[PDB]
Amino acid sequence: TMSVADAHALIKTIPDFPTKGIAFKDLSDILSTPAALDAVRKEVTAHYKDVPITKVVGIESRGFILGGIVANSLGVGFVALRKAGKLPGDVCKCTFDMEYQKGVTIEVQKRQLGPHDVVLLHDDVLATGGTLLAAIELCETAGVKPENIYINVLYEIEALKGREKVGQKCTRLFSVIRE
Amino acid sequence: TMSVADAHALIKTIPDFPTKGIAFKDLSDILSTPAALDAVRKEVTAHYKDVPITKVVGIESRGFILGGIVANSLGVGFVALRKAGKLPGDVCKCTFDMEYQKGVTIEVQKRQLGPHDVVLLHDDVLATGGTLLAAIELCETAGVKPENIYINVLYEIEALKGREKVGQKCTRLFSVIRE
Numbered sequence: 130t131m132s133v134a135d136a137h138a139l140i141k142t143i144p145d146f147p148t149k150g151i152a153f154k155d156l157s158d159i160l161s162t163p164a165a166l167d168a169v170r171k172e173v174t175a176h177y178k179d180v181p182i183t184k185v186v187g188i189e190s191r192g193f194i195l196g197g198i199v200a201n202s203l204g205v206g207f208v209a210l211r212k213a214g215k216l217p218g219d220v221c222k223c224t225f226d227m228e229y230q231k232g233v234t235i236e237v238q239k240r241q242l243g244p245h246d247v248v249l250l251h252d253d254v255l256a257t258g259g260t261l262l263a264a265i266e267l268c269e270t271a272g273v274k275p276e277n278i279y280i281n282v283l284y285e286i287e288a289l290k291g292r293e294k295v296g297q298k299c300t301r302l303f304s305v306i307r308e
Numbered sequence: 309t310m311s312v313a314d315a316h317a318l319i320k321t322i323p324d325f326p327t328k329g330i331a332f333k334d335l336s337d338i339l340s341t342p343a344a345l346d347a348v349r350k351e352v353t354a355h356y357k358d359v360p361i362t363k364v365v366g367i368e369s370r371g372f373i374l375g376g377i378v379a380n381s382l383g384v385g386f387v388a389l390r391k392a393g394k395l396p397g398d399v400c401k402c403t404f405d406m407e408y409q410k411g412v413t414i415e416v417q418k419r420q421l422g423p424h425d426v427v428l429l430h431d432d433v434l435a436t437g438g439t440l441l442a443a444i445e446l447c448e449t450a451g452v453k454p455e456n457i458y459i460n461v462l463y464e465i466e467a468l469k470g471r472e473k474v475g476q477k478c479t480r481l482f483s484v485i486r487e
């Protein structure tokens with residue numbers, strides 16, 4: 130049976146993508162290899178076994194893949210945080226900047242989150258930490274209490290120290306793999 | 309325990325979204341309600357129990373949520389079909405048109421699919437059928453045999469007769485819910 134380290138060995142590093150200068154970490158082979166996807170899933174589910182999570186909040190769009198898997202595995206609902214203009218109904222918004230794009234805007238439906246929730250914010254990669262910091266703000270504006278947010282990412286690029294950045298709003302950050 | 313019909317009862321119909329004229333079917337409450345997400349998942353997994361699926365191919369972006377869940381539940385890898393310019397490495401492409409956007413381009417990594425695969429193409433909603441028809445072309449260009457593609461959607465809007473459209477390329481189409 131594959132281990133988390135085996136999953137790590139499946140990651141491809143593509144230079145100059147999506148633009149020259151950025152070394153893209155392609156985690157696609159982890160998702161397409163069942164034994165690897167399981168290893169990573171089990172690591173996440175085991176880590177939060179004693180945490181009363183009530184909702185998994187996944188970030189559009191790569192945060193949706195292992196995001197739904199983890200929610201269903203934990204037995205809790207999945208909530209989508211997505212790019213502006215996509216979610217119908219009442220929504221909370223927040224504009225931010227990430228590694229290769231400025232002026233991004235994420236949204237979440239007001240009705241999907243509130244003070245009773247314990248959220249597991251999940252995304253695939255932690256780079257600078259802008260998407261997640263903006264994500265934490267979204268959840269808090271929707272009513273979720275600061276102490277009730279937990280963050281999980283599949284891959285953490287420690288180089289850009291996003292953990293410290295995100296640390297200003299949330300210090301319960303668990304990453305399956307560190308570069 | 310909730311049933312598929314209960315899940316259906318959770319869908320919201322938002323008028324004039326994303327633009328006036330289009331009645332958006334919001335399936336978000338199904339995903340955020342664990343009992344509903346399970347009911348729908350079990351319906352999909354039970355339907356393909358006797359099918360030797362080797363890969364679930366989910367369509368960016370709403371096709372990612374139940375897409376990964378179903379792949380992990382079936383014990384097979386997940387492959388992302390996404391909007392152009394996002395996937396690194398060698399890719400196959402195909403441009404199409406859907407209900408509220410013209411000139412869309414989807415891509416898939418060449419290495420993720422081939423002749424040995426039996427694919428379960430999954431997307432959340434079947435409207436006109438353009439995204440899926442374009443999706444079938446992508447898989448076939450990547451090497452997947454026509455007889456080895458199966459299609460699944462969470463919600464089918466029979467009004468726009470997308471099943472007939474997609475039927476020109478694939479007639480193994482299973483929809484959890486029909487409007």
Ligand SMILES: O=P(O)(O)OC[C@H]1O[C@H](OP(=O)(O)OP(=O)(O)O)[C@H](O)[C@@H]1O
Nearest residue numbers: 189190191227228255256257258259260
């Ligand atoms: O730590 P940060 O610097 O904020 O960068 C990380 C985020 O950027 C990427 O998403 P992207 O915006 O490319 O969207 P996608 O998921 O649709 O690829 C990645 O999937 C993370 O969500």
Ligand SMILES: O=P(O)(O)OC[C@H]1O[C@H](OP(=O)(O)OP(=O)(O)O)[C@H](O)[C@@H]1O
Nearest residue numbers: 368369370406407434435436437438439
């Ligand atoms: O049958 P069709 O007319 O092709 O329309 C259906 C497709 O359109 C919507 O996706 P959208 O393009 O809005 O992308 P999203 O998943 O990012 O919302 C929906 O999620 C289906 O994928």
Ligand SMILES: Nc1ncnc2cc[nH]c12
Nearest residue numbers: 152153154155228254256
């Ligand atoms: N280097 C990198 N690799 C993969 N995803 C992201 C997202 C931001 N930076 C990235």
Ligand SMILES: Nc1ncnc2cc[nH]c12
Nearest residue numbers: 331332333334407433435
């Ligand atoms: N009416 C509709 N509702 C939800 N998604 C889509 C996607 C195309 N048409 C749609």
Ligand SMILES: [Mg+2]
Nearest residue numbers: 189190191192
């Ligand atoms: Mg992302």
Ligand SMILES: [Mg+2]
Nearest residue numbers: 368369370371
């Ligand atoms: Mg879609």
